[PDB]
Design a protein around this nucleic acid. Structure first.
Lengths: 253, 554
RNA sequence: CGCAAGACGGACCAGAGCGAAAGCAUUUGCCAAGAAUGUUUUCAUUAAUCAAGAACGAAAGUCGGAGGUUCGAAGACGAUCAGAUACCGUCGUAGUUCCGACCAUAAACGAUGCCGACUGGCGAUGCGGCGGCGUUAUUCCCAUGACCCGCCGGGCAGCUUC
């Protein structure tokens, strides 16, 4: 299954690669090909239209994209929304994220929704020879970090935000139902990432707070991580300061 | 091959089995072609092939298994070639060639009914063909492209309808042709600033002075001409369903090509609010459609008020969707049933007649913005009793109550973004959404008058932001360098005079205003007043409701 | 393995269809004909049955031409039998086939005249029309196709009973 389904999604990815280039070099140059003045009927629809490249890339690329998306949705999803072992799921998720980033973004809503639903079915399902949750932080931590990085960057990439919010909510829920273990690495990683992604959107207040949180994490990780670097400490203190002095009052209009 | 009797009778016997289950249905066309390419004689005519030519371009119709469909573009071009040839035969010639006897040659079709609506069987065709093109511009799809050769057939049918216009012997000139004219104005009406100002702003002393250039400058007149003309050629029918249809298309021309005054006049004269009730459900869509473009050209002339009231009636509802024939059965829960919403899909509408709804949205939400942010600035300086729901107040409120907004990435959020900037009273925040979201969003990029409407937006923001600033700050003042306000909000003293003058008169402020010295002296207190006037109101509200509780009781 | 001649339309082919009866199965086209059903079209009693008289009418047979593979009266042989001019085996003429004239007969049998009215039940089948919860074909979608259910005509038949 690993060899077959990897080779399937790999064959579909190359058909879309060829389909874009094809449409984006031959047909895209056929489009705006030649002059660019007076379209006879191109100016009239200029009151509610777009460019010629999107207008004819929809004819020769949208197919590939759509197909790939559908496959990813029904593939691992409609064939492996859980089960026992076999990660590959991480790779699938990564691919989906990349696709969303590149092609259409709406896919994020669908993919995200599906993921959440699946997580709910299991977390609030528990009824099958599936994964015997208990102390198996391997797969757990794995999927966790995976979705995290994927969600974080994803949202903080296509200018999404609700998606990022959903991701954070999910992570919080996991921590709640996954607080039975002490705590492994990655923690610091995610913390820093989030604080950063925040910074602006929210006030440098909560952002600076998260920054100080990551700074404190650098202490624990230090005693356990061990980082012999002064520059690091300097940068940390700097980030702390800023995030702090920034706003002395909010304008609650 | 022998005197136009065998020929004619076989005409009969081919135009007979026209309908039934055994048609072959395409080699009747073929066989009409095999009485023409083997029709190579003389006088007799050039002459009477015209009519056969009708019937046979009518083969170039009827092949088609029904009325819902759209016409293999090769079939489409063959149609064209036929019709075009059957302009040839019917300029050159003039005898009218299913009647008016001459010397003879060579007929008989006086004897059936009238030469003449079988003469008038060329307008029929061409209207049909308009309609077939229209059926085209539905099944081809959409942002992209078969699309352009089809647009080109569209050019060519423009051609045809133009042609079907100058000719007119009709019965002579005026007195019914008007419907050619109708088609022609249906293909003049939804066109553009650039082609109402190729006469005026493709430079009129830089353009050619050649009869042809006048035919161009008259071509821009020629539709708003046929208004003045063909009112009487209809002028003459009172039928509410064509009256209420025609005038809605006329009000369109005005506001876009010319004065919004004439547009404002024409609907206000007509009073078609009553008349649309008598009208059938296409003209309902026209009524909605015309209301759009007037609230548009309200905002383009720069009037917040009229653009508000115009675009209000649409934005009370979420039906512009279903009115433009786009609505699902479920897109909330409301929009049943299946077989009935298809009527809208069959009747409505080409893609080249649409407008962006985010445009319509933003243009409405921005018009209201300049009215309501001073209004609420005034209100929260305790002028509140004028607080009105189900308005831009609500539409701003739903977007306001997001805990989580950082940078705006939706057109709603860009309106919310500029709204917050207007509250703070910094010009700066207006410019954000007016530049960036209008590039996103291409709210800006659909008008040559965005250049104008920029200036109209800007100075209003600078004046009303000054006003929102003043509604709060005027407790803090003891006096004002009025010169500062001019410099700071980027305004000039003549206007800032007139502004501050209007303000202190009508907003009923307790400022004393030295206009020659350019000074205000105010000293209007008190910060505790915000509580005191509030409990004074809370008090005063007591007795007033209480008198109703009395008058009910007794 | 190839060629020629003449004959013949298997299985599919059925208490199935069409024709007044005798009869009628390879493909495709042409020529004229007919039943049933549909119809708020036309005519207005124009009908039913039939001496005289008329058309068609299996197979065999006769006359004149063509053809003659196959089968085969007659005939010549071989057996079986007391006898065996037979049943059975071999050969074989007329005939069997086609074209043009005759012949008018059959268990030409449903052994059951034709036209009309009335009087049980039930399930099928061929054809037309109409009504319908649905699957199914295609172009993605009520063109008209196939399958399912019910109803109305007229047709070949069957089952059931104080």
């Amino acid at each position: 299954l690993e060899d077959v389904v990897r080779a399937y999604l790999k064959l579909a990815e190359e058909k879309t690669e060829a389909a874009k280039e094809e449409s984006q070099q031959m047909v895209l140059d056929i489009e705006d090909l030649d002059n660019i003045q007076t379209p006879e009927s191109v100016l009239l629809s200029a009151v509610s239209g777009e460019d010629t490249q999107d207008r004819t890339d929809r004819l020769l690329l949208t197919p590939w994209v759509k197909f790939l998306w559908e496959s990813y949705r029904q593939c691992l999803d409609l064939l492996r929304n859980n089960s026992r072992v076999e990660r590959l799921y991480h790779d699938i998720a990564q691919q989906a994220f990349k696709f969303c980033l590149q092609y259409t973004r709406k896919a994020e809503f669908r993919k995200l929704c599906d993921n959440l639903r699946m997580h709910l079915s299991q977390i609030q399902r528990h009824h099958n020879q599936s994964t015997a949750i208990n102390l198996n932080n391997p797969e757990s931590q794995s999927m966790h970090l995976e979705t995290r990085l994927v969600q974080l960057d994803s949202a903080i990439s296509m200018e999404l935000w609700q998606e990022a919010f959903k991701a954070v909510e999910d992570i919080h829920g996991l921590f709640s139902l996954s607080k039975k273990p002490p705590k492994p690495q990655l923690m610091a990683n995610y913390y820093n990432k989030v604080s950063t992604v925040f910074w602006k959107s929210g006030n440098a207040l909560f952002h600076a707070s998260t920054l100080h949180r990551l700074y404190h994490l650098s202490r624990e990780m230090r005693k356990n991580l061990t980082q012999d670097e002064m520059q690091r400490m300097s940068t940390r203190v700097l980030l702390a300061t800023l995030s702090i002095p920034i706003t002395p009052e909010r304008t609650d209009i | 091959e022998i005197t136009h009797a065998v020929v004619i009778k076989k005409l009969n016997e081919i135009l007979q089995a026209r309908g039934k289950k055994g048609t072959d249905r395409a080699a009747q066309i073929e066989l009409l072609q095999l009485l023409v390419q083997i029709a190579s004689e003389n006088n007799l005519g050039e002459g009477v092939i015209v009519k056969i030519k009708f019937n046979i371009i009518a083969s170039l119709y009827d092949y088609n298994p029904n009325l819902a469909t759209y016409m293999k573009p090769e079939m489409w071009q063959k149609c064209l070639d036929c019709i075009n040839e059957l302009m040839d035969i019917l300029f050159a010639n003039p005898n009218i060639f299913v009647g008016e006897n001459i010397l003879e040659e060579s007929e008989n079709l006086q004897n059936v009914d009238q030469p003449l609506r079988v003469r008038g069987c060329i307008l029929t065709l061409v209207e049909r063909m308009d309609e077939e093109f229209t059926k085209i511009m539905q099944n081809t799809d959409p942002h992209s492209q078969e699309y352009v050769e089809h647009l080109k057939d569209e050019a060519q049918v423009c051609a045809i309808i133009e042609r079907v216009q100058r000719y007119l012997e009709e019965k002579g000139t005026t007195e019914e042709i008007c419907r050619v004219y109708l088609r022609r104005i249906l293909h003049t009406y939804y066109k553009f600033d650039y082609k109402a100002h190729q006469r005026q702003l493709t430079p009129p002393e830089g353009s050619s002075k050649s009869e042809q250039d006048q035919a161009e400058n008259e071509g821009e007149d020629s539709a708003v001409l046929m208004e003045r003309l063909c009112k009487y050629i209809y002028a003459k029918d009172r039928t509410d369903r064509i009256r209420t249809c025609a005038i809605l298309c006329h009000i369109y021309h005005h506001a876009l090509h010319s004065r919004w005054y004439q547009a404002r006049d024409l609907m206000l004269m007509s009073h078609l609010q009553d008349n649309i009730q008598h009208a059938d459900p296409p003209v309902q869509i026209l009524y909605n459609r015309t209301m759009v473009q007037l609230g548009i050209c309200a905002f383009r002339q720069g009037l917040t008020k009229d653009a508000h009231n115009a675009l209000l009636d649409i934005q009370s509802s979420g039906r512009a969707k279903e009115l433009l024939g786009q609505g699902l059965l479920l897109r909330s829960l409301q929009e049943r049933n299946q077989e009935q919403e298809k009527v809208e899909r069959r009747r409505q509408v080409p893609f080249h007649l649409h407008i962006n709804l985010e445009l319509l949205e933003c243009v409405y939400l921005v018009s209201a913005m300049l009215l309501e942010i001073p209004y609420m600035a005034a209100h929260e300086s305790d002028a509140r009793r004028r607080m009105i729901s189900k308005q831009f107040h609500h539409q701003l409120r739903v977007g306001e109550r997001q805990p989580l907004l950082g940078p705006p990435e939706s057109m709603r959020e860009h309106v919310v973004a500029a709204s917050k900037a207007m509250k703070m009273g910094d010009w700066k925040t207006c410019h954000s959404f007016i530049i960036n979201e209008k590039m996103n969003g291409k709210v800006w990029d659909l008008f040559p008058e965005a250049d104008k409407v920029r200036t109209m937006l800007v100075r209003k923001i600078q004046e009303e932001s000054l006003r929102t600033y003043l509604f709060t700050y005027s407790s803090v003042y003891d006096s004002i360098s009025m010169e500062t306000l001019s410099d700071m909000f980027e305004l000039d003293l003549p206007t800032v005079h007139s502004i501050i003058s209007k303000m202190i008169i009508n907003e009923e402020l307790m400022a004393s205003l030295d206009q020659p010295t350019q000074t205000v002296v105010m000293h209007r207190t008190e910060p505790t007043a915000q509580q005191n006037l509030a409990l004074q109101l809370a008090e005063k509200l007591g007795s007033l409701v209480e008198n109703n509780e009395r008058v009910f009781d007794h």
